[PDB]
Amino acid sequence: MSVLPFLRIYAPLNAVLAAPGLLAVAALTIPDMSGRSRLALAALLAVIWGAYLLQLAATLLKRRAGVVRDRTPKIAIDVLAVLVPLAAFLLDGSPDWSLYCAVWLLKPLRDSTFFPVLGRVLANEARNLIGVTTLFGVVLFAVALAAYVIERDIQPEKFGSIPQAMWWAVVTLSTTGYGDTIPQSFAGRVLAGAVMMSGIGIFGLWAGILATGFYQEVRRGDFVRNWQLVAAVPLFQKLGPAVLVEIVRALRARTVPAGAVICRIGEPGDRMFFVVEGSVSVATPNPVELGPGAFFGEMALISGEPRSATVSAATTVSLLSLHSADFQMLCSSSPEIAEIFRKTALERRGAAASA
Amino acid sequence: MSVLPFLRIYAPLNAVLAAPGLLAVAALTIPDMSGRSRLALAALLAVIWGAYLLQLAATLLKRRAGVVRDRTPKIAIDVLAVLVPLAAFLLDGSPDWSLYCAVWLLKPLRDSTFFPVLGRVLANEARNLIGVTTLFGVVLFAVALAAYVIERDIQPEKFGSIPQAMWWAVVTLSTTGYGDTIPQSFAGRVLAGAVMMSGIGIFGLWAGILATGFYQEVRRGDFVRNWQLVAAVPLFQKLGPAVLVEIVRALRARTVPAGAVICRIGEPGDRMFFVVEGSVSVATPNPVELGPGAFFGEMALISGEPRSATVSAATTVSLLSLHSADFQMLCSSSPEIAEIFRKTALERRGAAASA
Amino acid sequence: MSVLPFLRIYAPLNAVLAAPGLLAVAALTIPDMSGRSRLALAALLAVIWGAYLLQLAATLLKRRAGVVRDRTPKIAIDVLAVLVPLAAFLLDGSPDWSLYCAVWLLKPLRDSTFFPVLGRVLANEARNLIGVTTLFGVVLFAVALAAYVIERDIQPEKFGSIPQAMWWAVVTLSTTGYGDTIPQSFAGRVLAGAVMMSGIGIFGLWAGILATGFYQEVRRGDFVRNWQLVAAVPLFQKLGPAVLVEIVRALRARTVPAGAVICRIGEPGDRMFFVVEGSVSVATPNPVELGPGAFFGEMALISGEPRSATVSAATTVSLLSLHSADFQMLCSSSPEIAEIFRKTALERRGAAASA
Amino acid sequence: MSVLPFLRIYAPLNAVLAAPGLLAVAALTIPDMSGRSRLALAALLAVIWGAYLLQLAATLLKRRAGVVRDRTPKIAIDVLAVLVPLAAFLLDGSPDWSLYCAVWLLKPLRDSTFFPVLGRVLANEARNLIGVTTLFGVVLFAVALAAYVIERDIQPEKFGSIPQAMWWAVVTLSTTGYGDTIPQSFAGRVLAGAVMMSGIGIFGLWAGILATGFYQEVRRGDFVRNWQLVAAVPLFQKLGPAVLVEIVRALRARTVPAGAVICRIGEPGDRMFFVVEGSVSVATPNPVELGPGAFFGEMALISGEPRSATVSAATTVSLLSLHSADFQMLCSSSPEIAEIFRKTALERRGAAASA
Ligand SMILES: [K+]
Ligand SMILES: [K+]
């Protein structure tokens, strides 16, 4: 609610081409299809193949930034991105060689930030997951066995065994309800009463395990990335030690590309930003082009008024962002700083028009 | 638990008429129906059409409050509220013109506050949603492909292709369990074991993403709307800076219409209010009609007793509300203020009967 | 994890008899049944009827504690508890009069504390629920309509109308998957992709709305009930104002009946209690029978040792409970109090054996 | 995200053998199977039987650590681990004696820590669960009854009774959607509209009840286990009282086995550890083998640089772990301690190479 995401978050075309790349699978998979478009898209495989292969060697030029790097992840698939189709094309002379479009599916995951954010936490919290997973196996066979006791008599063809009953366990436990093989007797139908009660109690924790400290990591991701952009601000030699741990939990940083809009004049002013790198276009008779290490919005927050200036992203600006309360927290947190923001809320009234 | 919502929250009839408006669709949709009621409700379309159209021009008189406004949202549908049916009536000479009752469905959403509250946050947090959505696409085809490996042989008519297998993917992943095409072999039935385990882990985050900071926004909505009604209270020149950030998280404000009841005498006193605008009917021999900038309940909270007065909403009062603990927090937070509430818990004993 | 619930939480037999009471419904509902047990349980209705009716008049003696009370809830059903069966017995001469066993179902809810805890909060937070409920209606027909566009042609008997399509909406949205009427075409099967994605995003908030501040109320329920049992403790004239708001969030109170065990000797000591009313049996050569306003466990917590005494509930004791950390919080929160607990951890070593 | 789990968390083979043990059930359960492998695995039962029985007596030697112990849980199944199969083998002369493989399923749960963590909390919070469970029974029959009103006429074979309708209740309430018996009329199909709305509101709390304070216990589990490893650190005589309650919520402890890696040189330094027991291999010209009561990473955190030393687990080290922010919290929390970490960030530069 308090950030401006711009400049092509889903940027690199190395990721993009999997989506059209893998829909190219389908038409080969289908009888009664004409040969025209059949092979037209086989080229598209060769495009993407060639396209990453074009990209490939430029990556294999890993002399760029060659000091200390850990690029086993990034490179691992690029190699197989082109070999696996290639080795496939010959030995699998039959059309099923296209089935090695299971390969690019990592290419999104290759340059997928936020995916290592996932695997980072599992190796602290899987301690619970396994005791639950065991418990998930406890309750499976603890319950799955209860049915073979019963309907083996009058449902041999369905419940004439244990693992057939294990099938109806997770289906019945995992919220699903396929609807293939269901009891007829009473006591077995009694047993289902606890199952949904159970699995929804089970998953009530287990899926909760994920979001539990995942959110901590992401709420922590908003600090590790943001203890940066702190000392750059020339004012923050006076902030107390504990002051900062409060604030940075809310301060998310995102970038704006050049040319785009930041805050349009007259829109309801609801936030203020801290510029730390780049430059802006504060639309005034003298454009107050504040570069690295600046801010604006106190003209709008202290007064609670619309924007006093159409700020447009002159350049690639690494922005922070902040809603009022936590800035009211700040002006509450210290009178010493509202003084300059009091002055600045007067200086920028005269320094907007003037220089 | 600590607020009095009254005065027609679901007020404007511009919203109301969609509900009866769109049930008017149905009877036309149905064979073997008599023509009597068939066309009776076609009028009702013309009513609502005419009714908004009656409303319409009064809105197009946008000279009301014409200083600085952003009414592209509000007006966008009102225009189409009446044109789309109208242009429909002629070219679609066949009865299917009524199918342009897809149009009013925004009219609730037109004057739906709390809906922009939704879209506000997605443009900070969709960063995650897409990495998950990709991941949702990862796991779809990563898993959907695994089945065509198998049952293409003995289930051509069902699993004789990939996207047919993609169908059984999300159905099997998204908790649903339709029950149309299900395996027969073992290894494919093995694969389902992880699926529900997965999707319930997937959605265990992804739906959690929504409530995650949504609740922050709404818990923030209770501050942005409520840093108002602060300075109006004549007492709050002495409250510390950080005192307020604690409190306003709990203080929700709602309005009471005139005539209605606020706190009935003798009911178990469980809360106290801060009046800031309007007037009341404190039912006493001298009605202590406290107007803008007042409160009551300390007579009941300090003593923990029932109500000492039937307070009824004399007028349209913009109320705050507060349960004890956070008022006990207050009386704990400062002895200087309990003094006047000590006195007031004596003055209002004598000032209830007297003037 | 830190409380001792005892003394028949599910106590009153006025609640109990619904469960056997309503299973008495069934055998009448069933053909090919013998008349013997058919009417045997019709008596059991008359038992419970007579049993509450026996209870009834003793309740209608509402001279007990007759000062200020709000007993419209409690009495409302008791009246109908016996009239509704009675008026049923005659006019409904056919056996279906037993269908007025829909009546006792409130009798649990009659003396169901924790149920008003539910309805208390909905009248603060249903503001959201309705904007969501509208939104739930938005997305219903916004999506339900999309299908009649398509399969009316080749599925008249199933999708030959709108509300038939509304049926497949919520079924498909609400996680369920019945499996009666499913598409065959592509584009309609495309549409389901967003649905589960939606409804699981929808309910991802909406059910979250419930637990959101419900937990606040219950986490608040642990304070409102527990700002009691504070001043009774003779030591708590020195605790700071803000000290208490920290602590009582964790301190839950429950009662122990007489005779039962409290802490058995030698078990791993993990907590300490504050007695405020009743008496104990501290099993020592001189039983240190501490009555109202006492505590024990610091002998075990400071040393981190097993229990030094088999404490058994001599009487009906209203207990508090506390795990270490928040007592370590206390001994951390003030050195002035650890002094007496230092002394007490010596006095009770000598005062356990001695008097 | 901030811990190193190693040394065989899922260690004891007493747990392990259930998994292969119980898959041994299946092949006996199946007709048309050869007798060869039929009996081969019956031995495997005798293996595990004999294997625990081998383990058994060594456990019955409970003279180890015989001071004060509560081993009724641990021993209860071991006894039946071998008797139940044994008594089964004779009286159940038919092959169904193998059905007493319901017995080992506790053996995981025997030495399952984190399972008592489950049952600990239910006896504080089941107060709610039962009022909900009653409410779950309220809404069951409150709703289940509504259908027999209707479809008993034209669905006797399906809805010709109440409990048959109770079947379609929980199936329809508990998110499942089997798909066996579904209405045809309107008003009954109206009723389902609230059901999913209800049960997803129901379970929206009820499963939430579990994770609610479960997470508290586990977030409390990270303190009770970790008020240990506090005084051992020679520095922590100066930490304030309240300082610690902040920190230990994040500090999780895990063990590393001997030989394994701790922090490899050059990897991106993201955390620092507190050694309290064991020894390391700080790979330097003079290996700075810090034993009980040590730490490292401030060389990497203050500078925000990669690792300055390949630390490998020389021995079984009981490690703590800590990411920056909470160490930045520390260096923020007190200048007095950053002094020695300032010096140490210089001493270990010279004391890494030197001794
Ligand atoms: K389902
Ligand atoms: K189904």
Residue numbers in the entry:
A (entry chain B), B (entry chain A), C (entry chain D), D (entry chain C): 1 to 355
What's the publication's text?
Here, we present a high-resolution application of SPA to electron crystallography data, using cryo-EM movies of the prokaryotic, cyclic-nucleotide modulated potassium channel MloK1. Each of the four MloK1 monomers forming the pore has a transmembrane domain (TMD), a voltage sensor domain (VSD), and a soluble cyclic-nucleotide binding domain (CNBD), which lies in the intracellular side. The total molecular weight of the tetramer is 160 kDa.
We then applied maximum-likelihood 3D classification in FREALIGN28 to determine conformational variations within the 2D crystals, while imposing C4 symmetry and keeping the alignment parameters for the particles constant. To obtain more insight, the consensus atomic model was flexibly fit into each map of the 3D classes using Normal Mode Analysis and then refined in real space. A rotation of the selectivity filter by about the same magnitude also occurs in this trajectory. Finally, the most extended conformers of our ensemble (models #1 and #3) also have the S6 helix crossing bundle and the selectivity filter slightly more constricted (<1 Å) than the most compact ensemble members (models #4, #5, and #6). The eight obtained 3D classes have a slightly lower resolution than the consensus map, likely due to the limited number of particles in each class.
